[PDB]
Paper text:
Instead, SaPI activation depends on the formation of a complex between Stl and specific phage proteins, which act as inducers of the SaPI life cycle. To derepress SaPI1, the phage-encoded protein Sri binds to and induces a conformational change in the DNA binding domains of StlSaPI1, preventing the binding of the repressor to its cognate StlSaPI1 sites.
The SEC-MALS results were confirmed by the X-ray crystallographic structure of the Sri-StlSaPI1 complex, which was determined to 2.9 Å resolution by single-wavelength anomalous dispersion (SAD) using the diffraction of a selenomethionine-substituted derivative crystal. The asymmetric unit of the crystal contained two StlSaPI1 monomers (subunits A and B) in a dimeric organization around a non-crystallographic two-fold axis, with one Sri molecule binding to the StlSaPI1 subunit A. The electron density observed in the model suggested that a second Sri molecule binds to the corresponding position of StlSaPI1 subunit B. However, in concordance with our SEC-MALS results, this additional Sri molecule showed an extremely low occupancy that allowed us to only trace the main chain of fewer than 36% of its residues. In correlation with the low occupancy of the second Sri molecule, two regions of StlSaPI1 subunit B (residues 32–47 and 83–97), which mediate interactions with the inducer in subunit A and connect the DBD and the central part of the protein, present high flexibility that also prevents their tracing. Therefore, the biological assembly of Sri-StlSaPI1 is a box-shaped hetero-octamer of dimension 95 × 95 × 45 Å, containing two StlSaPI1 homodimers (subunits A–B and A*–B*) and four Sri molecules, two of which were tightly bound (subunits A and A*) and two others with partial occupation (subunits B and B*). The tetramerization surface is generated mainly by the mutual interaction of helices α8 (residues 194–209) from each subunit, forming an anti-parallel four-helix bundle in the tetramer. When complexed with StlSaPI1, Sri is inserted in the StlSaPI1 tetramer, interacting with 3 of the 4 StlSaPI1 subunits and burying ∼1550 Å2 of its surface, which corresponds to ∼33% of the Sri molecular surface. Each Sri molecule mainly interacts with the StlSaPI1 DBD of one subunit by using helices α2 and α3 to contact StlSaPI1 helices α1, α4 and α5. In addition, the Sri α3 helix interacts with the C-terminal α10 helix of the symmetrically related subunit (A*) in the StlSaPI1 tetramer; and its extended C-terminal tail is positioned over two α8 helices (subunits A* and B), which nucleates StlSaPI1 tetramerization by interactions with subunit B.
Author numbering:
A (entry chain E), D (entry chain E): 3 to 51
B (entry chain A), E (entry chain A): -2 to 243
C (entry chain B), F (entry chain B): 6 to 32, 47 to 62, 66 to 83, 88 to 89, 97 to 240
G (entry chain D), H (entry chain D): 4 to 11, 15 to 20, 38 to 42
């Protein structure tokens, strides 16, 4: 939950909490927000030689 | 006042979106010949199913242009409903029940049973679709099953079976013009891309695509999930897992 | 079978059938040698100097200038005989409406030039797919409701991408090789019967 | 106004109206929406030779 | 219970964001030496201005990571406010007035007067900024004015004044190894990119960038508008015109 | 002034000052000729065959084997004399911590290798800008409130772009030229005093 | 020592890997 | 006819534009 947000988004636990506390109750709103920032972080590592 | 006939409204909306007859024909269940007639007035005001087919044609084109994303999905609907109301309150309209909300609800019903059928038929050539063994008409869902995947920019760049040509213009693949002797049908086909070039190109494309768009580890799981009839909210939740690992 | 160089170049019974003769019956003789002439050439100042001489050895190859001026005559007959059969479809060959098999001048003309990269990118008739490994929706995350185009054809390259790809490819090609302004003139100046050294100094000027 | 939406976004007048009618009153909401779709359409024409 | 000192909270938040001391030093008005001390406890609980400087350091780093876009702009604030409340209710805290809403409002006031000053100083080297005659520290706004624009990937690819090197690895620019004779300091510098290559590269970059990001016709008008102190809503409205022609 | 080929190659008084001699005083003699030896070479099988012979004419050029074996000796002195001054900074020259002026082996070593493309893209110390013609914000339209980074440095390339650029550049370079695995070995095998034909057959093996 | 026939009867019998 | 001195005293005095 909180610890998954922490690792994935690369924020702090305190910041993960404030991230939950806003759009709180609405699991789907918090989920949509989560997935939004998670799609920004692209597969920048490509098959280099 | 002077109020337009069904045919005059069909033309007005059709030309507003810069559609030809063939274009709207291919988008709709309606034949090139019958559309033209309905716009003239040589055939009489049509069945409610053809009005619905025609509106599907519009739907799978305004979505192609304006987008089917959250805000424009609604705006696309309210517009299609408005066009539907108009054909119903036409000057030469033969529709008895002139109730907006019913006819809207009928049209939505008609799309749901229509897409269920269009899904079920796609599920029969599922492999041919996924493997991209389909000729697909730009700006349409209208598909024709083919021998190979000829319209897959990757499959072309991949296969070494046939020689892949470039427009006869930046076509000097003989970088070494040291050769004072010219080969049998070498100057005939001096455009073909060498397996180096053809995969130097694939690289450049994927590096670019990897930067802009999401990569899909589970090509097959993703496709299976997306294509199967299931509550869109259940579906998108399921698709987001696959992609972003959640 | 003789000296089986088929295997020493990695060929087959369905590959030589298309190249020359064979006809799905591996075991006339003059004809089959053609199915290895251009193969060394595909697979220059110092090369062509010793490429011919490589297959010249095989001419000699039980069961000189003998065949150097006898078989080499049969070459000039069958290449101008097919080149008169190629002049009957020259429009198809310039437009690129042709299936040219890899290192193989065996042909079969087709309605639209499917195997032209620059055609596929610069055409507005048919959708152009890519791998099923790329989600090319862009507004995917803002689509709470999905269409048939979304579901089955999330893998379609859009115009903005098809143009960016074409412009990468030609920015690349412009670096290595040179551009031919007179597309038709360059093509016709070589598809003629005239001698290799004739057009040699003529084509250079165009450049 | 309407005719600017028509030309820029490349929709119909009827569709331009429905585009205004939703998020109506709020000039800024309608403006933000306008500008959003307008940024999608990129300078795909590049300096080709 | 056992409650952490200011120093122990500073460290907790600082290491949570994987910041070093130098990193937080450079982000804040605070010296590498004084931060370390405040985390130890060798110097006493600090002034409200250093707490504010430190929080600015955090602000111009959470914004660098999480983003300063609409949803995360608020979440970034509520977080900075929360960190501010904590330093105030520290075990070794010497702050008399323990009012949340005042101290928040003070911190926001302190950023507004701070940014006004940081704008006014940027306006003095305006040309040096715009012309990219600045050394800028990754993940920071901390700028150092320099002789040229050395950290402008375009300016490097443009100038023919100096030879532009590539890592000594894909460094075989002598594609023609026909030369049996080797030149004076030719094998020394066999990495340099030729003016062809260096502008084949610029092309590839801009074609890519043109596809992803908005082009700016009025480089100067855009910059003048953005950089000048003006109601952000008035500003963004003004910037959107410039870009999209409205 | 003599035969003013300075102008026939488009040079200047601040260009030859850096190349050799001049010293901001255009009008010793042996030295200045060096400032045109590598210039023909920068600006192969058939070339170098007639490149030397081009400047050999100028040796002759009022106010043979005379200077062909006398000035050409002064070449081998001053190039191994500076090459012993270059061995005193060879680490700087391998790391690329050097301002090499265009077609000019006049140098000045610098703290960080600023003029290395592959360094600039693959370094995490300093922000990398581009033209002021590109808005590289991506979430620009969703920013109702702007920071200082937004306002003054909307033109900064982000990591995801810096990596995509580097990977385009090397995908490109890999097509034209060949990769040198032994970066240090290849560099040291050429920076030595040994003869051009010595290492000729040695370097090829590495490839 | 047949170091070309594997690196690239005829050709063996008599800038190829510089590409 | 000095068709090289403008296309590319010394060099004039004695694959250059094929690049």
């Amino acid at each position: 939950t909180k610890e998954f947000l922490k690792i994935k988004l690369e924020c702090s636990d305190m910041y993960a909490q404030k991230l939950i506390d806003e759009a709180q109750g609405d699991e789907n709103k918090l989920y949509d927000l989560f997935i939004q920032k998670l799609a920004e972080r692209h597969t920048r590592p490509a098959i280099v030689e | 006042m002077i109020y337009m006939t069904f045919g005059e409204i069909l033309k007005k909306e059709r030309v507003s979106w810069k559609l030809s007859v063939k274009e709207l024909s291919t988008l709709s269940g309606v034949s090139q010949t019958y559309i033209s007639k309905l716009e003239n007035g040589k055939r009489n005001f049509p069945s409610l199913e053809t009005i619905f087919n025609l509106l599907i044609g519009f739907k799978t084109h305004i979505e192609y242009k304006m987008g089917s994303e959250s805000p424009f999905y609604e705006i696309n609907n309210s517009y299609l409903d408005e066009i539907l109301i108009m054909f119903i309150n036409s000057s030469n309209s033969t529709i008895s029940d002139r109730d907006p909300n019913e006819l809207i609800t009928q049209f939505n019903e008609y799309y749901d049973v229509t897409i269920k059928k269009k899904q079920n038929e796609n599920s029969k050539i599922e492999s041919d679709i996924f493997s991209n063994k389909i000729k697909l008409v730009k700006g349409t869902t209208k598909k024709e099953v083919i021998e190979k995947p000829y319209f897959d920019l990757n499959w072309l760049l991949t296969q070494n079976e046939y020689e892949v040509f470039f427009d006869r213009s930046f076509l000097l693949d003989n970088n070494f013009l040291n050769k004072k002797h010219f080969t049998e049908k070498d100057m005939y086909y001096y455009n073909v891309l060498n397996d180096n070039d053809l995969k130097t190109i694939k690289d450049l494309i994927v590096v670019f695509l990897l930067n802009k768009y999401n990569y899909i580890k589970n090509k097959d799981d993703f496709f299976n999930i997306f294509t199967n009839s299931e509550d869109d909210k259940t579906k998108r939740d399921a698709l987001y897992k696959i992609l972003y690992e959640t």
